[PDB]
Design a protein around this ligand. Structure first.
Ligand SMILES: Nc1ncnc2c1ncn2[C@@H]1O[C@@H]2COP(=O)(O)O[C@H]2[C@H]1O
Length: 127
């Protein structure tokens, strides 16, 4: 049941909407569904990371020391984050904190580097 749910969800995300269905299937098989509550750190700035996150429920706040924290933006269902530590250096460039009950579909580096990393929408992500 979860497998089909994951594939339908991934398809609905514009970044992933055009992937071959077998690649979507592989992603659905390797991802880990992870749950957070309000105020829980998902990512800390300056940590070293190896995971990519797709939000399937809730919202998160992104902040950065750029010594007090500054608010960058809020991300929500269908948005994703954590790609910068998978591009070149592995350092996290911002904090990501749950703003309510959150579900993320988590993709590790082993799968990301084959199935997602070649996507321009991810590799050339502007901000
Ligand atoms: N200015 C910003 N606005 C929104 N998201 C950001 C910003 N800077 C970094 N991020 C996201 O926060 C993530 C923190 O970990 P990564 O650097 O791996 O990937 C980062 C991006 O997904």
């Amino acid at each position: 049941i979860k497998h089909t749910e994951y594939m339908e969800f991934l398809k609905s995300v514009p970044t992933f909407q055009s992937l071959p269905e077998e690649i979507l299937s592989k992603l659905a098989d390797v991802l880990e569904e992870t749950h957070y509550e309000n105020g829980e750190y998902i990512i800390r700035q300056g940590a070293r990371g190896d995971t990519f996150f797709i939000i399937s429920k809730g919202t998160v706040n992104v902040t950065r020391e750029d010594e007090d924290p500054v608010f960058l933006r809020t991300l929500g269902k269908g948005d994703w984050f954590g790609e910068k530590a998978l591009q070149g250096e592995d350092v996290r460039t911002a904090n990501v904190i749950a703003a309510e009950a959150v579900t993320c579909l988590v993709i590790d580096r082993d799968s990301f580097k084959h199935l997602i990393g070649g996507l321009d929408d991810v590799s050339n992500k502007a901000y």
